[PDB]
Ligand binder design. Structure first.
Ligand code: GTP
Ligand code: GTP
Ligand code: MG
Ligand code: MG
Ligand code: MG
Ligand code: MG
Ligand code: MG
Ligand code: MG
Ligand code: MG
Ligand code: MG
Ligand code: MG
Ligand code: MG
Ligand code: MG
Ligand code: MG
Ligand code: MG
Ligand code: MG
Ligand code: MG
Ligand code: MG
Ligand code: MG
Ligand code: MG
Ligand code: MG
Ligand code: MG
Ligand code: MG
Ligand code: MG
Ligand code: MG
Ligand code: MG
Ligand code: MG
Ligand code: MG
Ligand code: MG
Ligand code: MG
Ligand code: MG
Ligand code: MG
Ligand code: MG
Ligand code: MG
Ligand code: MG
Ligand code: MG
Ligand code: MG
Ligand code: MG
Ligand code: MG
Ligand code: MG
Ligand code: MG
Ligand code: MG
Ligand code: MG
Ligand code: MG
Ligand code: MG
Ligand code: MG
Ligand code: MG
Ligand code: MG
Ligand code: MG
Lengths: 109, 37, 422, 120
RNA sequence: ACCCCUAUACCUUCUGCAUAAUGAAUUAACUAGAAAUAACUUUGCAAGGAGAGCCAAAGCUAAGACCCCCGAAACCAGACGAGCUACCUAAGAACAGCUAAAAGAGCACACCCGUCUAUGUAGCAAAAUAGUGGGAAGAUUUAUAGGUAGAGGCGACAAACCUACCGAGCCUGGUGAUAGCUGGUUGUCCAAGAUAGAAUCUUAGUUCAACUUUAAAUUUGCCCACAGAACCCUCUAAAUCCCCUUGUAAAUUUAACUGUUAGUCCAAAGAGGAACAGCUCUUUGGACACUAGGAAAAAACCUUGUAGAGAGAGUAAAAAAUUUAACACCCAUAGUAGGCCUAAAAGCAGCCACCAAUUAAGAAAGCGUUCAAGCUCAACACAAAAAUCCCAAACAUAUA
RNA sequence: GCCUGUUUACCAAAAACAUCACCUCUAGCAUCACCAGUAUUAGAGGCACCGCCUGCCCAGUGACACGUUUAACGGCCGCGGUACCGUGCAAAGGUAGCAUAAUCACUUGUUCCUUAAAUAGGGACCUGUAUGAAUGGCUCCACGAGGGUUCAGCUGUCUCUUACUUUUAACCAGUGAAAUUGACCUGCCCGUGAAGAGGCGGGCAUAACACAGCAAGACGAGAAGACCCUAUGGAGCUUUAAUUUAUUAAUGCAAACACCUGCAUUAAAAAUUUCGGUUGGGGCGACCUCGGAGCAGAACCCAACCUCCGAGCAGUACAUGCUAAGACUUCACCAGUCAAAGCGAACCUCAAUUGAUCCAAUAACUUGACCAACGGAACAAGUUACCCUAGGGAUAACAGCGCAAUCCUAUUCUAGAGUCCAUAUCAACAAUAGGGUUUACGACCUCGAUGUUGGAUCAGGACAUCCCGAUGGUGCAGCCGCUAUUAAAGGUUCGUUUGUUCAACGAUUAAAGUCCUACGUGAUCUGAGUUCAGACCGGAGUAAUCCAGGUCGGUUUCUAUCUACUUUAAUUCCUCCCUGUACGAAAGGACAAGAGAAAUAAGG
C-alpha cells in the first residue's frame, strides 16, 4: 500500500564551516530551504545553494532579517509581528583575505 | 529483544556487577539504639 | 470491532418461508436491534431482496445474487454482511463469503457473538469455537491460487500426514474436547441446583420472547431492587433464580431466563442450555407475552415451538400460566382468550391477580397439601412446622395446650412431621 | 547508540576532602604524570585504542611520563578507565647530566637520582 | 609401558563443525596456474633506441616476473542396429481329453500369459522360484527368412517397443562442448591483511566504489581549544561536524593489482513481529571468523592480546545469595416493639428521622429469627509440577 | 466395462485401448501402397453390441460455401407480483432419462433395509446451477484373476498358540565373496554444543578377551534426495509465446510457348529459441523508476513485502542566448547540480515532473520507446507426476531446536452465579506465574537421504491420577457423586462402519487416564490412507496439462563391524454375611469385621 520513499539523501548541508579558507565560486552550503541566509560576499544559486563570491574566510553570524518590501509573505509576517520584535537569521559571510590588487612600478618613463 | 520487555531482561554481567557494587548501604549506628536509654 | 454491517434480508415470496404473521420491515428492525446489541457495530446499509427459492444454496436467484454481490463489492465501507436467514449451511456460507469478499453472519452466528461479547462465559466461548471449526479460504476478498503440489511428497514409498488429513484430525479432536468441556460445565450447573431440589423450593421459570419484560415482571414479583431490566435485546443474559413470596405466604423461586428469539436454533445454542434445562426442571412455567408488540403472534409461535421441541412433560406444558405484559402500552386491552393474566410490569397493575393465579398453580403442581394440623405446644412441633412448611394461619386453644395450624405442606415434610412427632 | 562519552567538568574539580585523601595541594600542582596501562584496549572502542597508542601506553604496566597540561589531560580523560595516573615526584630534584644514568622510578612514584642498590 | 594431569582427528564448506555436514580402508605410482596490455627490477645505448617495419617531448632495446584440474543432463553431423521388442511380408508348424456342435463356445493338458500370495532383493535370475491363476480352434501360439531406422520407425496410445539403462536408440566425431554449480588445487619460513555502497534478467555471479597489498613522491595525517553549523516545534537525547594546541607518525598523491562484495552474537538508539524467537531490518561500538585465561562444557560475555627457551615471580578476569504469616480479653441497659410499611416484619425486609438517658452504647457495625426471641463489633469498667537417572564431594566459627 | 481380446518386457492387466454396431468427413479414380480395388468402394475419425432414445442452439471458433454445418469445437438464464400472472435478455435457456454417482465441497447429505452395534453395502428423495444424452444418457442378457457388499460352509486368519518333518541354522572338514571401513585404546546418566554426544564438562561404571542371539543407537550401509527451491542449466509436449517459410500444396504475375524456372501471397506442416527479478521457502497477491516527511531529534550517510504523502506535468517566457573561474554530487561510473568574471543583451516558476548507446527521420537544426522489469536483450508464452543434470539444509515438507501468539495448567483479585452465602462447585473484567502435548511463527543441523500417517510387536518414562490405597471439605442423611492433598507398586477390554488416530454406536469393566519417548519403535513387521509413473468422473484451460476433489491399481532392500542388551513378597473383582441393618418420610440403601469363590500377572 505504501509505495515510493526510496529516494536517497541529497547530501546537502554545509560544505565549508567557519574559519575555512574559501576560494571564489566555492559552494559553502547546499540547502533545500533557507536554513543559512546569504551574507556579505556570498551568493545564492537557483536552488538556494550558497557560494563564495570572494576569496576569504567563512563566518557564520546571527543578523536581523529585513526582507525585500516586495517579498509579500515576509512583509505580512513582519506586519503581524508585535512591536519590539526583531527577526534574526543565520548569515554566512566571506571575509576577503587578499586585496583587490597592488600598484606596481611598471615603467620608469 | 527490545529495550523495554514484558519480562525483566537479563543485564550484561558488567551492569550486574555495577548494580551490586552500587547497592544501597544503610548507616550502621554503632550501638543499636533499641537497647540504649 | 467497529465493524460495518450490510443487513441483507431475504424476503421470501410464495412457498415455504413465506411469513404471513410478520413483515419484512419488522424483521429488519429486529435484525438492526440485534446487531446494535453487540456495542461494536451498527447497520451501515440495509437491503431487502425478494427471493422465491429460500432453500437453495445461494438463497437468492442468479440475477439477485449478482446484483447483491455487485453492491457489496462496490461499497467498501461494509466490513461484514448479516444475512437474516436464521442459520446458513456451511456451503452457503462459503459461497456467499467467497462471492462478497467479506465475512457473512447469520442469526445463529450473530447470537453466538452476542453471547461471547456480552456474557463472556466459557460456554459462549466454547460454542463460538465449535461453530467456527469449519475454516477454509482464510484470505477473503480474493481467490488465491495455491499450487499445493509437491508438499509432503513420498520420501521412499509413502507420505506422512497430509493436509486435509491433519485438518480432519484437528477437527475431530477439537470437537471432542469442546463437547467434553461443555459436558463438564453442564454437570457443574446441575450440581448448583442440588440443594434447591432437596429443599423442594417451588421453582417457576419465566419464559418468553426477548424484551417481553420477564426481568421486570420478576422484579415486580420479588421486590428486589437489585434486578435491573433493560430495553436492549438479550439483556437478561445468563439464568438466575430469585426468591419471592406469594399471597399464601409461600416462598417460590422465579428463574429469570434468557429471552427467546424468532428463527433461532435455541437447542443448538449452548448458552441457552441453562435456560432450557431450568424450564425442563421447573415446576411451573410462566409465559410472558408483550401484547403491545405488533409481532406478538409470531413471538408466541416461536416460543411455543421452542417449548414443544424441548419435549417437556405434558403436565408442564399444561397449566402454563400466560401473562400478557406491557398492557399499559395498549390504551384499552381486553384478553379475549381465558386464563390469561393481563399485567403491567412497570406499573404493577395486575400483579396481585397474577400472584393469586400462579399461587393456585404452584399448589396444584408441587403436590403440596393445604391442611389444618393439631400440634402440642412446647413440643417444638410448631417451630418445626414453621421451618419446614409454610404456615397460613395459627389458632391456639389456650385451655388444651394445642394449636390448629393451617399449613401448606409437601408430602416429604408431612411424612417427616408424622415420624418425628407422632 | 553507543558513542564517545563527554565527562562533565564537575568530575575533575577536586574537593578539599579529595586533597586530604590523596595528598595533593591544589596550589603548586605536580608537573608530570606517571601513567601505566592497567587495562586492555581489547573490547574497547577504536578511539580509545588510538588514544592509548598516541600516549604510548601499548605495553601494560609500563610507566610513561607525560606533561600535566590540558591537552594531555584531555587524552587521559578519554582513556582514564584503562590507565593509572600518579604524580611524578622528584625528592632530589630533576636528574642532572652527571646522574642521568643512575636514576630509578620507584613504585611510590619517586624518580630517585641515586640508585646504589645498597642497604640504607 | 600403563596408571597421574592436559588435550573436542584432518580436509572442504560455513556466520559458526568434535560435529550425528562432505571425502577419505590403507600402501605405491600418476594426478591439477598456460599469457598479453600497462607497470616494476636489472643491463645496454641514449635525443635517440632497435640487426628495415616500430616507438620516442628520456626514450628505446633485452631479460626477469601474474592468470589451474575433474565432473553434467545437453546440441548437431555421419555411421551402425527390427538374431530382443512393435507391426508387417513369404511360405510352415502346434493345439491331448471331455461337454457341446460348423461357436473370436465351456471344463481342461501341452503351449502362451502373468491375477494374488510367499520366498528372493549382490537373488538360481540385471525380473527368478513355489503355489495360485487367465486364455488355451483363435483378434491364438510359434520356428525360419525378409521389411519399416531415430527430425525416424512401429504402436488394439501404455508417450508402449525399437539389443538389459528410449520424453526418444547406440557408436564415432565436433569434444578437452559449456557449467555464475560442487569437488580438488601438491616444498619451508616471515610479513601486511576481515570496511560503507551503487548498478546489474541481479542479489549462488560480475564491474565500479570501499577495504586490503606492494613500490614510489610529497607533507601533512590522527587526537582535537575557543568560535561556529535552522526554523518548522512548546519542550526535545547520547552525540556528531569543524577544529588551533598538544600527544603522536602517520597521511595524501602517483603506479600496478588482486581478493572480500551469501556473516554471526553481545551492549545501545530504533523499526517489523506478539514490548516472541538462537526471528528479521537499519545505525554506533565490541568480540568472533587468530592466541591465551575465566564464566562447567562454550565462535560472539569478561580478562588479555606480537609470538622463543626457563623445573622463577607479581598479577588480570575469576566461587551467588536468600527461609519468609499466632494473637486480644471483657461487656451491652436503653425512651420502645423510632415512625411509616406491611399478616407481622420489633437495631436488625424497604424509606426517612437518625436523637437521647444512664458513669458508660451507632434507634446498631455483623449473625439469627415466620415475626420475636436469642449470639457478636464500636461504648463502660479492667507457591508452584514432565517425561532415560538427583546430580561434584562436602562445609556454618583459627585472625584479607 | 457389452462380450472374446490388447496394454505400461522389469512396481499399475484396469473401469484405459481395441471391439462388432451406429454415425460424421473426404475421394469419380487404374500399372509399386490404397489396388491389380472403383461410392454396397477406399481412406481420415468419433462413439461403442444390442433395447428405448440421442432433446434445443450456427450467436462465437472451426470447417464448407459465396449462408450451411453441432453424431464439428462448444453452449443450453433471469427479474417483479401474489407454482402461475406478467416482463427482461439470449443462439437456446439442460429436454427425456438418471441422480450423494468413480460425478468439487458440504459428506459420515436425510431416511428404510441390512448388523447387537455399519463413515461400508443395497432401496429411495421436490436428492446435480459443478448430472445429462455418439465430450453419448438410461435399461439390460451374458461375460470379467476389474472394484464394492453379502448368505452358508470352511478353516490356525484370530481368541492363542502348540507339536513334528525338511530346509536353514550351530559344530567338524574343504573351498571361499560383498557393500562397508579417517583413525579408534569404540561405556551409562545429566548438562553443554552446529540447537538429538562413545570422544566435550560434572558424576557413575570399569581385569582380559571368545561364541550364539537382538535390533534401541552408531543421525547405520546403499544410491552426489526423485520431495522443495535455485541455475540468465536442460529436455519432452502444447500453443492463441517471439521469429521464419528454407520445405511442400495451392494460386497470381512473369518466363516459355500442361510441365520447368524466378518472384510474390495464402495455408499446411514444421524448425529455432525463451519463458524476468524481489520474495520470512516457492506459488498467489503486491512491487520494480523519481521526489518530500518520519524511522534517521543535532555535519553527511543509512534498511525494511516499514509508516505516510505525492511525480511521469503545467504555467510564463522567447537572450528560456554565447561563453567561462571555482565548486557541489545521491556514497563507483553514467548522469545530475550551482556559479563569479566576460561577450551579447535588456535597463524562468516548480520537490519529483524522466530514458543511455546503437539505430532510425532530417539539408541542418533537431526529434524518436508508460525501452514503467524505468542503467534500457531489437524481436520469444504456457506445461511437465514422463521428467533430467548441477547444486542448496544459503531454502521449504517430516523430525529436532528457539519462542509461546495459539494451546494447557495453577494461583491473586471478590463483581456475579450458587433460594440466603464469593471461595461445596464455579466465576466476568483483569493480574501473576508455570508447562512445552497442538496449530503456527523462525529457518539453526541434516537435501554426496535424519524413510514421515494409522496399525502390529515390545514397550521406557512423567503425573497435571481413569481404577485400586490413605486423607480434608461438601449445597457429605444413605447410595451415588463433586472437589482438593498424598500416592505412578499394579492395572487401564472386546467389537460394527471407517486407512483413521479419533468419533459414533453395541456389550462390558474397578477403570477402559492425559501425555512424552525422531507426533517411541519400517537395518522387527504391515502399507489400507497419503499430489510418482496408468486410468475414469466433476471442474479449469485452446491445448499440453492441472485440481491440498473423489475412485481403481501400483517393487518395503540390507549376511550386524561397534555400543547397548539377552534368567533382576501380585493385584483386582465378585458372592454370602453383616442386612434390608446403620441412614432415610419414602424411594432406596451402606460401611467396617468375617467366610468363599474366582479373574488376571509372575513362576513352575
Ligand atoms: N410500558 C412498559 N414497558 C415495559 C414493561 N415491562 C417491561 N417494559 C420495558 O421493556 C424492557 C424489558 O427489559 P427486561 O424485562 O430486562 O427484558 P426481558 O423480558 O428479560 O427480555 P431480554 O432482555 O430479552 O432477556 C424494560 O426495561 C422496559 O423498558 C411494562 O409492563 N410496560
Ligand atoms: N531512441 C530511440 N530509439 C528507438 C525508439 N524506437 C525504436 N528505436 C530504435 O529501434 C530499436 C527498437 O526496434 P523495434 O522494437 O523494432 O522498433 P519499433 O519502432 O517498434 O519498430 P521498427 O520501426 O519496425 O523497428 C531501439 O533499440 C532503437 O535502436 C525510440 O522511441 N527511441
Ligand atoms: Mg526518505
Ligand atoms: Mg518436480
Ligand atoms: Mg561418531
Ligand atoms: Mg563427519
Ligand atoms: Mg553438502
Ligand atoms: Mg563414507
Ligand atoms: Mg524379426
Ligand atoms: Mg482341443
Ligand atoms: Mg474358447
Ligand atoms: Mg493415455
Ligand atoms: Mg501420461
Ligand atoms: Mg537400449
Ligand atoms: Mg570444464
Ligand atoms: Mg601477521
Ligand atoms: Mg607478550
Ligand atoms: Mg466489645
Ligand atoms: Mg472388458
Ligand atoms: Mg478377458
Ligand atoms: Mg500389439
Ligand atoms: Mg509393468
Ligand atoms: Mg505384454
Ligand atoms: Mg502386474
Ligand atoms: Mg473404451
Ligand atoms: Mg467389513
Ligand atoms: Mg568352515
Ligand atoms: Mg546430549
Ligand atoms: Mg556378538
Ligand atoms: Mg535412522
Ligand atoms: Mg544412512
Ligand atoms: Mg544433491
Ligand atoms: Mg537457458
Ligand atoms: Mg560522488
Ligand atoms: Mg533496473
Ligand atoms: Mg497421471
Ligand atoms: Mg538431481
Ligand atoms: Mg518444523
Ligand atoms: Mg538453515
Ligand atoms: Mg538469518
Ligand atoms: Mg553421508
Ligand atoms: Mg499428585
Ligand atoms: Mg509434533
Ligand atoms: Mg497405499
Ligand atoms: Mg475430465
Ligand atoms: Mg488407493
Ligand atoms: Mg491388482
Ligand atoms: Mg523390511
Ligand atoms: Mg538379523
Amino acid at each position: 500500500k505504501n509505495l515510493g520513499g526510496k529516494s536517497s539523501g541529497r547530501r546537502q548541508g554545509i560544505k565549508k564551516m567557519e574559519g575555512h579558507y574559501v576560494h571564489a565560486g566555492n559552494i559553502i552550503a547546499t540547502q533545500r530551504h533557507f536554513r543559512w541566509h546569504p551574507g556579505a560576499h556570498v551568493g545564492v544559486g537557483k536552488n538556494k545553494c550558497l557560494y563564495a563570491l570572494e576569496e576569504g574566510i567563512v563566518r557564520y553570524t546571527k543578523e536581523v532579517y529585513v526582507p525585500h518590501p516586495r517579498n509579500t509573505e515576509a512583509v505580512d509576517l513582519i506586519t503581524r509581528l508585535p512591536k519590539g520584535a526583531v527577526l534574526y537569521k543565520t548569515f554566512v559571510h566571506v571575509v576577503p583575505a587578499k586585496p583587490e590588487g597592488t600598484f606596481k612600478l611598471v615603467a620608469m618613463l | 529483544s527490545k529495550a523495554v520487555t514484558r519480562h525483566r531482561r537479563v543485564m550484561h554481567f558488567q551492569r550486574q556487577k555495577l548494580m551490586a557494587v552500587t547497592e544501597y548501604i544503610p548507616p550502621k549506628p554503632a550501638i543499636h539504639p533499641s537497647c540504649l536509654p | 470491532g467497529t465493524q460495518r454491517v450490510c443487513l441483507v434480508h431475504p424476503d421470501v415470496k410464495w412457498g415455504p418461508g413465506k411469513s404471513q404473521m410478520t413483515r419484512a420491515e419488522w424483521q429488519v428492525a429486529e435484525a438492526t436491534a440485534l446487531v446494535h446489541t453487540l456495542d461494536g457495530w451498527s447497520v451501515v446499509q440495509t437491503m431487502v431482496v425478494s427471493t422465491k427459492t429460500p432453500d437453495r444454496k445461494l438463497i437468492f436467484g442468479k440475477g439477485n445474487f449478482e446484483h447483491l454481490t455487485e453492491k457489496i463489492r462496490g461499497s467498501p465501507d461494509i466490513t461484514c454482511v448479516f444475512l437474516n436467514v436464521e442459520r446458513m449451511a456451511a456451503p452457503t456460507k462459503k459461497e456467499l463469503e467467497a462471492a462478497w469478499g467479506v465475512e457473512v453472519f447469520d442469526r445463529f452466528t450473530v447470537v453466538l457473538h452476542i453471547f461471547r461479547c456480552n456474557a463472556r462465559t466459557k460456554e459462549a466461548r466454547l460454542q463460538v469455537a465449535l461453530a467456527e471449526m469449519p475454516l477454509h479460504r482464510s484470505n477473503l476478498k480474493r481467490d488465491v491460487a495455491h499450487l499445493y503440489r509437491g508438499v509432503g511428497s513420498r520420501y521412499i514409498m509413502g507420505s506422512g500426514e497430509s493436509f486435509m488429513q491433519l485438518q480432519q484430525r484437528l477437527l475431530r479432536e477439537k470437537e471432542a474436547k469442546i463437547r467434553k468441556a461443555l459436558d463438564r460445565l453442564r454437570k457443574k450447573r446441575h450440581l448448583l441446583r442440588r440443594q434447591r431440589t432437596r429443599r423442594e423450593f417451588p421453582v417457576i421459570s419465566v419464559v418468553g420472547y426477548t424484551n417481553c419484560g420477564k426481568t421486570t415482571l420478576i422484579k415486580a414479583l420479588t421486590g428486589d431492587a437489585a434486578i435491573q431490566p433493560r430495553d436492549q435485546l438479550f439483556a437478561t443474559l445468563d439464568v438466575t433464580a430469585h426468591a419471592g413470596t406469594l399471597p399464601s405466604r409461600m416462598t417460590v423461586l422465579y428463574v429469570d431466563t434468557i429471552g427467546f428469539l424468532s428463527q433461532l436454533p435455541h437447542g443448538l445454542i449452548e448458552s441457552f442450555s441453562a435456560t432450557l434445562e431450568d424450564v425442563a426442571h421447573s415446576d411451573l412455567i410462566l409465559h410472558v407475552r408483550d401484547v403491545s408488540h405488533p409481532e406478538a403472534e409470531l413471538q408466541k409461535c416461536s416460543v411455543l415451538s421452542t417449548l414443544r421441541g424441548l419435549q417437556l412433560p405434558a403436565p408442564l406444558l399444561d397449566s402454563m400460566v400466560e401473562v400478557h405484559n406491557k398492557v399499559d402500552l395498549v390504551p384499552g386491552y381486553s384478553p379475549t382468550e381465558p386464563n390469561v393474566v393481563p399485567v403491567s410490569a412497570l406499573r404493577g397493575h395486575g400483579l396481585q391477580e397474577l400472584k393469586a393465579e400462579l399461587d393456585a398453580a404452584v399448589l396444584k403442581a408441587t403436590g403440596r397439601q393445604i391442611l389444618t394440623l393439631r400440634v402440642r405446644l412446647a413440643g417444638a412441633q410448631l417451630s418445626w412446622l414453621y421451618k419446614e412448611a409454610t404456615v397460613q394461619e395459627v389458632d391456639v386453644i389456650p385451655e388444651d395446650g394445642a394449636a390448629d395450624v393451617r399449613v401448606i405442606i409437601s408430602n416429604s415434610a408431612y411424612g417427616k412431621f408424622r415420624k418425628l412427632f407422632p | 547508540k553507543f558513542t564517545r562519552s563527554r565527562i562533565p567538568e564537575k568530575v575533575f574539580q577536586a574537593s578539599p576532602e579529595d586533597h586530604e585523601k590523596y595528598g595533593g595541594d591544589p596550589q603548586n600542582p605536580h608537573k608530570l604524570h606517571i601513567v601505566t596501562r592497567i587495562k586492555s584496549t581489547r573490547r574497547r572502542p577504536y578511539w580509545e585504542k588510538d588514544i592509548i597508542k598516541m600516549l604510548g601506553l601499548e605495553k601494560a604496566h609500563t610507566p610513561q611520563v607525560h606533561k600535566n597540561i590540558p591537552s594531555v589531560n584531555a587524552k587521559l580523560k578519554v582513556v582514564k578507565h584503562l590507565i593509572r595516573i600518579k604524580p611524578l615526584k622528584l625528592p632530589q630534584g630533576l636528574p642532572a647530566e652527571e646522574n642521568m644514568s643512575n636514576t630509578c622510578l620507584k613504585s611510590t612514584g619517586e624518580l630517585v637520582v641515586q640508585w646504589h642498590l645498597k642497604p640504607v
